[PDB]
Amino acid sequence: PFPYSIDFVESKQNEQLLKDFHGERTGFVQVGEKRWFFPSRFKQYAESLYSFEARPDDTWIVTYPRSGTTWSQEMVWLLCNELDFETAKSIPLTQRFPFLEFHLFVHDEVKAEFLKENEHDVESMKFIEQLSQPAGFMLAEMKTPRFIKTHLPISLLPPSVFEQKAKIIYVARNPSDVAVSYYHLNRLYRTQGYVGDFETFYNYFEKDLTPWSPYWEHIKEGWAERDRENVLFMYYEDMKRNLPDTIRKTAAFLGKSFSDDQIDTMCTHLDIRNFRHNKSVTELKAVGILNSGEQGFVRNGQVRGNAEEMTDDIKRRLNEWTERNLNGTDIRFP
Ligand SMILES: [Cl-]
Numbered sequence: 001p002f003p004y005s006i007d008f009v010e011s012k013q014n015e016q017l018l019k020d021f022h023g024e025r026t027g028f029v030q031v032g033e034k035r036w037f038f039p040s041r042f043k044q045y046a047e048s049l050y051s052f053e054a055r056p057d058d059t060w061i062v063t064y065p066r067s068g069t070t071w072s073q074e075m076v077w078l079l080c081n082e083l084d085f086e087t088a089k090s091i092p093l094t095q096r097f098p099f100l101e102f103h104l105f106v107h108d109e110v111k112a113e114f115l116k117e118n119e120h121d122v123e124s125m126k127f128i129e130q131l132s133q134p135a136g137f138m139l140a141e142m143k144t145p146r147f148i149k150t151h152l153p154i155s156l157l158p159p160s161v162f163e164q165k166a167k168i169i170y171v172a173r174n175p176s177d178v179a180v181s182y183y184h185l186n187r188l189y190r191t192q193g194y195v196g197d198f199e200t201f202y203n204y205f206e207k208d209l210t211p212w213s214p215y216w217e218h219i220k221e222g223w224a225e226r227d228r229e230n231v232l233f234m235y236y237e238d239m240k241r242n243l244p245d246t247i248r249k250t251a252a253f254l255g256k257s258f259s260d261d262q263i264d265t266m267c268t269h270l271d272i273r274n275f276r277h278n279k280s281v282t283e284l285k286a287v288g289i290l291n292s293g294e295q296g297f298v299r300n301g302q303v304r305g306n307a308e309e310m311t312d313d314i315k316r317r318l319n320e321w322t323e324r325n326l327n328g329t330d331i332r333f334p
Pocket of ligand 1: 172173174235236237238333334
């Protein structure tokens with residue numbers, strides 16, 4: 001029984017969101033007192049998501065979007081699979097490390113466009129249809145330890161995750177870098193279908209009218225669980241600043257043990273230079289669900305601490321938003 005209210009966004013805001021977000025064609029919902037933001041299919045799948053059955057040997061990665069999720073998944077999958085680089089290379093990360101709630105973001109009317117554009121390839125069409133099915137069905141069938149990615153906040157996780165004490169890695173990333181990266185995610189994924197500029201996107205993000213917002217409630221919930229024995233909380237910039245410490249610490253949290261030589265191969269694999277050529281960074285592309293015109297940011301990233309999309313006005317608003325939300329907490333980005 002799904003315990004929280006699911007209400008459509010107020011009529012006029014909902015109308016404006018549909019003008020700017022072409023990946024959704026019915027509308028957007030806000031969930032419970034914190035008003036967690038989702039497209040319409042959340043209402044259809046809320047019960048089946050919430051009653052998903054975690055296992056005590058599951059490894060969950062829980063992040064706000066573009067908070068180091070793909071890099072962490074690659075690091076974690078390898079640490080839990082005896083550094084099997086060959087298997088990691090040959091099987092896509094989306095199969096090795098499925099995304100619990102991706103199916104929320106495949107609207108029937110957008111799916112029909114994808115199918116039209118791939119109508120002459122039966123395998124492409126099966127792939128697209130599967131995107132719209134819950135990952136939970138194939139996860140439930142697995143008889144080996146599972147690796148689950150989600151952006152669902154702590155308060156919307158299946159209660160079975162904490163009941164079973166499944167291990168959770170929570171990664172937090174500073175809101176300036178999240179805003180710019182999440183903007184690019186919204187342009188890259190036609191399931192989002194965002195058409196506007198960075199400033200219009202920041203306006204939505206600051207109002208918690210982007211999926212999995214409120215951002216600050218996401219971070220605070222993660223911070224409020226980090227003391228549990230089955231939760232490891234890290235800041236994105238700390239993880240990237242010291243790969244050897246990140247790898248050892250993560251390995252230790254997961255109950256795994258590796259040599260200096262093994263830690264070194266994992267540092268090489270996860271180095272920004274090599275990771276830029278990793279398959280998990282570049283299937284979605286082949287059926288044209290990724291926008292091939294938006295691979296600029298994928299190839300190049302942002303100028304560190306001064307994204308070209310950033311304006312002094314938006315910088316100042318990010319500072320004030322940060323102050324309002326972190327005042328009277330001990331949360332501090334590196
Ligand atoms: Cl950070």
